[PDB]
Design a protein around this ligand. Structure first.
Ligand SMILES: *CCC(=O)N1C[C@@H](n2cc(-c3ccncc3)c(-c3cccc(OCc4ccc5c(c4)CN(C)C5=O)c3)n2)C[C@H]1C
Length: 277
């Protein structure tokens, strides 16, 4: 039967070669993972969390990783898999290196060359990965375009899921029930998915630009939402609006979003209007 792949790594066994970026949970480095007793040198990304932690707190992280990072059994092509973890005065997470970066930077850098087929396919892929997370009862809590990574321009993967349940704030991506009462469910992830789609359709525009984070809940209560992106027909915008209903049970399911976006992906020029398709 299918085994649980996550590995506990020694401080040796992997090396950090260059800083890649970040300033949110920690610092990401590109490096090599040399599994002891083997002859492979695997290129990996290493996230070293900024908080300190203790040997007792590290055991709680280990207990959470055993419940969490293990019950992602078959794997999904659109979900990043945690290859290893090393807890020793710092918390370090090891995944396969993705040289092409995040989808947020990609859509900003290629604004003038992105077609409707690519945009709709990324929506399909993100929903497939999120549906897989829902099947394994894992709430992401931080779905955003910065947390979607580019394997190839035709293949994206979700990363950084459950990085809050591991031990113990993106207001403009959060559902109203998350802002007000810190309630997080697969349906609050659907809201964040809708904001992520908006990010892609606006080529990486900042949601609610120039509006303070303290004002978002009162704007959502008033009924205001993110505007219809220029390339979006009413069809795609309606899906986004459904993701942002106050009633979490009235929002789409990731399983329904796979079907809607896959239908739109079959005839993309009908749903997105881009100068150059
Ligand atoms: C462009 C956006 C940006 O600046 N960032 C995105 C974010 N980031 C990027 C990477 C990464 C870069 C290159 N190659 C791969 C990944 C990561 C990242 C690095 C190392 C580990 C890591 O783990 C995420 C994760 C995966 C799976 C699980 C968890 C966490 C928790 N559980 C339970 C899992 O199963 C991600 N991060 C920051 C910056 C660089």
């Amino acid at each position: 039967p299918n085994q649980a792949l996550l590995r506990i790594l020694k401080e040796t066994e992997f090396k950090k070669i260059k800083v890649l970026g970040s300033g949110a949970f920690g610092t990401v480095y590109k490096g090599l993972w040399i599994p002891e007793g083997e002859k492979v040198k695997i290129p990996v990304a290493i996230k070293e969390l900024r908080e300190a932690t203790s040997p007792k707190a590290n055991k709680e992280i280990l207990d959470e990783a055993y419940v969490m990072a293990s019950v992602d059994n078959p794997g999904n092509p659109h979900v990043c898999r945690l290859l290893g973890i090393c807890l020793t005065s710092t918390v370090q997470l090891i995944t396969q290196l993705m040289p092409f970066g995040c989808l947020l930077d990609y859509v900003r850098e290629h604004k003038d060359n992105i077609g409707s087929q690519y945009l709709l396919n990324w929506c399909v892929q993100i929903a497939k990965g999120m549906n897989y997370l829902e099947d394994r009862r894992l709430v992401h809590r931080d779905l955003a375009a910065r947390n979607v990574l580019v394997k190839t321009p035709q293949h994206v993967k979700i990363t950084d899921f459950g990085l809050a349940k591991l031990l113990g704030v993106p207001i403009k991506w959060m559902a109203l029930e998350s802002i007000l009462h810190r309630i997080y469910t697969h349906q609050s992830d659907v809201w964040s998915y809708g904001v992520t789609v908006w990010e892609l359709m606006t080529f990486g525009s900042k949601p609610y630009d120039g509006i303070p984070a303290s004002e978002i809940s009162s704007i959502l209560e008033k009924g205001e939402r993110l505007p219809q992106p220029p390339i979006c027909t009413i069809d795609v915008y309606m899906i986004m609006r459904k993701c942002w209903m106050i009633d979490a049970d009235s929002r789409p399911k990731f399983r329904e979003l796979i079907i809607e976006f896959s239908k739109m992906a079959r005839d993309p020029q009908r749903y997105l209007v881009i100068q150059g398709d």
